[model samples]
Target: SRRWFHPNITGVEAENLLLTRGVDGSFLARPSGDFTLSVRRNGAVTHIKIQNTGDYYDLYGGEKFATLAELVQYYMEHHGQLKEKNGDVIELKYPLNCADPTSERWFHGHLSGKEAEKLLTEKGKHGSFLVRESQSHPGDFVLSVRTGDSNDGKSKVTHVMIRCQELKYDVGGGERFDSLTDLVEHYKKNPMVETLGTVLQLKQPLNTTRINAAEIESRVRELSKLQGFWEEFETLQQQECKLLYSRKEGQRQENKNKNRYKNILPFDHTRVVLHDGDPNEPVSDYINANIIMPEKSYIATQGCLQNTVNDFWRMVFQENSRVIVMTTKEVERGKSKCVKYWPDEYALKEYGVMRVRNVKESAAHDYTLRELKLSKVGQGNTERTVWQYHFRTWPDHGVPSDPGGVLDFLEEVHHKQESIMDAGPVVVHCSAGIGRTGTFIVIDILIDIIREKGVDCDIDVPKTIQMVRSQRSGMVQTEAQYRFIYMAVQHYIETL
Candidate 1:
């Protein structure tokens, strides 16, 4: 009978899985052949068969079975453990499953992006890195990979199959066979970039945002259909919040999002924190800020933590921040938000080993800008100038009525940051460092990607938000914030 082989998959791929899973232990010095593996489906049954076999004593687990199938059956029944670097066990309530919801090794399409993010985060937490894609989405994809062990003998495995999505994974084998295609593709250049490329190739008309959905409603249904838009974003909002509360860690900061509740660690080893400083203090001043990729883009930090204020300045100086975007006011509805972190122009205010002196100030219709000078305290007292921009009118947990004001202010900051050829990242923050914080960073990041990819309406905003979250916890924090990002970007695209 003619066999239906996964032309791209081979017997060695099987051996890699076997060896990694401790299934192939034949240091036999004897087993050699034109190794070609094939899989076929007879009714509901799938069979994996190899052309030949020998006295290959299984090293992974002692299974004196006649075929590789027997060995696989046992390994599948007894899944492997997930280990962190240095081989510490990352406990899992259940064995890690391939992330695709459609190809269930263990596990939906209604799965909100945030829910999928949490599920994969759990798998990642336990050393299982996976990519998840929306079945309902034509082009949207979620890419996840970690710098850790597959617990298999090999350092990493790309020819791996996930249980559900089209994206591949680092795990050797699971039930799912899709994640991102081209098993050989993930090994090349930046995986994230490749991921976006895959999405763009699909040319799925992504809604981008509710405000932007109407434009594509004719062809797209799941997303472009605007009637239930908030339901989708709101699902993300709740899931996002739930994940935050579950992941929040470290000594408590004044900000809710910076604690052990709203801002827990991520599925990746990403956080923006002080590289080095007063080590004896024995605390992470603030949870590590997030990265902006390539240049470590912007630092999304807390605005006013009584204790973290000094540390905040240290981060600013060390990061070589040229522009600071403050979106929240000091007080909101009779409650305090961010504490004052700037200087009063004349006096040389000290923070850590640096001093901040206000040099110039100006006001925009919707925001204010301050020019501050910074210098070290001793000898040469090295100094630098920085811009602090405060958006005065944006209400708490609310966006500007029109994207024009927000866009104008953001464009100025964006241009200034890009102006300096070798400038470090800019710092942006609001009350919780998530809601408005994620709000602002996402807008610029989207615009940046737009300019780079020739920003079109047919793109995944949530996917971009997830990319940002991988850099920091809870980016694009609220549903409104998410909607805001789209509206702002729509305004930006039209202006261009």
Candidate 2:
């Protein structure tokens, strides 16, 4: 159903819905006079009169649309085109869903009490708040709010219980409202006074940016001003200190030289094992790679070492991986980062039992796409196509200044991966595979999640990185790389 259109909801009701359920630029259409477009901006709801003159619908003046939905979509696409008589721009950044409580931006579907407090305290303002389904109380909800700082100068988060009985909501005693929106609207004006005389204000609602892709911009902007991403990455670093997973496979005597870095090795549980090549020598079944299982998984391995080039090809053919993503250049700042694994354009190269021919090479803005044909030494009739997307613009000093290019590169890379039938996980690599490799994989995973589920789906960037790190140690190496994932996701959401 189209939740944006509310047939009989009044102007006041629309204001309450937008104020309580939507963010600053959220909007909806309702029948007031003929049709009114209600948009929330700067904490207030403004109703822009929509004109429906028999044949066509228009927003009073500018561009005319054939339907109300078209009118809404046009203004949403072309920002700053719709404005009030006073020349104030009325941007339609997000659509408001008033019928369902689960669609509300303030509703965190299954958040625990501790998680709610941590989120509110870290990235929230004095009056920022969110509502979550209660963990212990069935059919009830909890309102977690950041209630400013305490006497000791530490920010305090408070939780208030919202009891639901007969489908009505109440915070224990005062008033019972038909919807959570109405309940929140009531408390915004009238503060919830505690029995011990403490006042809890519901000023600015803390939105869950996971579900709404458009809302990610606000979160990214908020996090950029403060060091919010740093806080998250730092906490993730501390949590991983306790994870003492075994890396005994990479430490073996025969496979020691295969790793680009000594300490950055794949975990034993998820490391990729090559098919046995010899009966007596079991060390031939080793590769410095891990099967990362963070949704639509990928094989993250280090850049090919000079001595391990043959083993790299062995793993690719064994796993049937058709797509290869290299995030590092061969040489950076006069130091050799990765050996040239594939042959040059229109050239053939041999690596152990496999022969690879570079059939074609094309260049994009920030990356190069190379098509290679793979086959056994004498089996030229049954050849397989492999794609290598080598990203060339990743700065040696820090993350990219913009994420638009990386997002486009990923779009093309996935297109190739999806085109093949029965293809294995995409092989991803950077110098040591954990730093840039992890960052790119994490961004791609989050983007895929948002694409499959709507923009309103919940996503935890820090948690996603943690999940990837569990499969391979030190996935996102630095805090800057961690923050880049958020920036890349936010960029992708804005395009949506």
Candidate 3:
């Protein structure tokens, strides 16, 4: 047996050396050629042994090696793609999943040609900005660094990733910097540009909406007045003994019969009070003539209420069609039984539309049953059936936003309402017929009005809401609910 000697090189040092070679090039060490270059005659064999020399102290002892990938990883982990002058690192903020991130498609597919020309023209008129492609992904592009300070540690760089979808690469690590100038210079000198292309595009600033505060104030005032007018009209109808008499008769007849019967009125129920009085008399006449009309009637009719519930339905749903009502029985800890409801029975009766679907979900089935029993009280001859929709709210906290579940429900209602609208009007409502009810109405109105009038017109949302409230007091009582309607309408308009 022959004695064997282990190489002096340790695994860690070997690994470090391998990494160094991968990054820069190979490294080699050799002892002075004083030792014999041993070779046996006839059948000669040679053995070589390697050792880490203390001379390469940094390489053998302290130095650590990293690959480009590792470098990129480290850069991303610690620095992100953006760094503030104050050393705060920022990450990419674009909705990358929805937005086109690749430069080639974003520029050539969507923004190129006529669109690009228009952009350039605007840029020319205002002031031109630079455009460049990404160095990592060829044809992917972005705008150049806008402004930054380099001398002080207070530099700020603003850059956007373009065609990110095409790149399928996330920026990490040293990829983020505080100075656009530094980024640009790096791109100019580095071969990264050859691989990825230009990294920036500069264009003119976007046009902004000009505010006319005085005009807006005047319009708001006018809207307030119009809102007052509609509210007043709703109040007069609520107080009118004649309309009340009709409603009472309808309710009484419904109670008297077991068979489903329609409640058709001769006049437009929404404006009956305004039109029911002497045809020769002005609206003021009806307001003055109605003994039951309360003072402060205008204020009384400014929100969704029970009396104006049908009116809201008339504006949004079919006037006389069977509609679906979806309710959450345990909303707000069972204190509020009906979070949302739909398809006004009055409208069904008036329009002769012959279907109603009632869906209820609650924590307790017995509680739901009791609530439904109360709901059905005093109503006559309306063929309504209830179905239970059981679901746990706490577990499913993050529901998908697209085609929102609420919207899906409304879409079904809309399909039915569309059919009825062709023949007559549809009705939709919920308990007290506001909040969710008003939201539905607003969405419906926005869709129809945009289809017909387009969004450019001076459509008065507050007035429309006021009109709904007039029909059913407190249709939109909560500020949040009101804001939802506004946001919904705004979103619809933007998409349009």
Candidate 4:
């Protein structure tokens, strides 16, 4: 295979990929600086080899990796692939440490709108680059790229490094910036930028504090453009084949209601496996869940159904979920939204072998908090407390006037979850588990990524949706809901 070599990633992840693919063993050649791995398929063994050209480096040389132990810096880039003359293909996964520190969500564009058009028009692939849309300025575009002219027999990017500022208004000319951070702050003042391909400004000291009115309003305006605007928002809905299978609601016999199927359904791989039992065992229909983190992290399911409400509790009991975020009203405009899954205070209800009892309930201006006790029959006589945080005020088929309501509700949930760090998935749902549910899941993860990586982090809404949808079908159901996700994250960052 071609030298799928790079400086940013560790050799571990690359090796793991091969091992996961079915490699049986590996050998290292001493003198030639080469390595080979052997894999068996259908009783046949195949050998693959990787050779090192020198003790120095092909990507960089003479400049001997001095000061490689520098402060950790998070750069942005794409996952790569390679092809060989003999028709061999390999995926190049960058090392974790050097991997894109932030995320695609934070990245303004895979390629800027203009650059994408140019590349498609020319029928060629240009090298990678990072482009950010202005937060406040109109017609403003900030780009970082390497032309490769400086390749001194080594790396291509070493040729010339430049930050070019282009304005749509100034069609005939372009400006330049020395640093991306400075370019970002300038855009924060808000002028001359399009929302199509852009990012939010970096906000630091964001741990627990809040932002002021001026910064908040500015952030709101900049992020607002992205709220109602998305290139793939409508396009994603047209793919009927992709979302047809998640109808677990009416799939199994004994479905409590004929109108169980809502807007979408869940995929097989990420779908929650219900506990096995009798044929009428909870009907085996509707009330599906998806793993957002790992086995025991975040779960996204539909709001309670008439027949599925009991199954909902079975899941909460099965996974030992700690936080349940209900983003819809029990009755919205006189329509049944979610079934009352938890019992009234001091009352216990049974679903299959699991029993749920509501110990305490507190009503707030915008949400209701309930502490629940769950136990399974024929199992241990154990009781576990599940914190149910039901957020009111979010309208059906609509968005909140201000994202602060959802943000505040989430922060409160997070604060409570700190006590049970090892608990099961945090269950979040709206009506169909796609629209508001997708919004909640996306915002929570995006905020989390930023919190873990830092404020300079990038936000890729499409990537975010793809990830959420991979777990549960039709996440972020509508364009309106997608825009709500944008504003929700924006509100949180600004408040922080």
Tell me the whole-model lDDT of each prediction, alpha carbons only. 0.50, 0.78, 0.31, 0.51
Model 1: lDDT equals 0.50
**Would you estimate the TM-scores of all the predictions?**
0.53, 0.59, 0.28, 0.55
Write down the RMSD of all candidates, one decimal each. 19.0, 20.7, 28.9, 20.2
Residue 358 lDDT in candidate 3: 33
Candidate 4 displacement at residue 413 in angstroms: 1.0
* Model 2 misplaced regions, further than 4 Å: 1-212, 280-282
Local error of candidate 1 at residue 23 (angstroms): 42
lDDT of 3 by residue, 343-370 (tens): 3222322311223333343443211211
Indicate which candidate wins on lDDT: 2
Task: Write the residue-wise lDDT of candidate 1 on 337-409 in tens digits.
Answer: 7778787756668876778898878978999889888776773456778889899988643456678998899
Best by TM-score: 2
Which sequence of candidate numbers ranks them by TM-score, best first?
Answer: 2, 4, 1, 3
Q: What is the Cα-based TM-score of model 4?
A: 0.55
Which is the better candidate, 2 or 4, if ranked by lDDT?
2
User: How does candidate 2 fare on TM-score?
Assistant: 0.59
In model 2, which residue pairs have backbone atoms overlapping below 3 Å?
Answer: 211-455, 211-456, 211-457, 212-456
Model 4: weakest 10-residue lDDT segment is 66-75
Q: Could you tell me the lDDT of residue 142 within candidate 2? A: 92
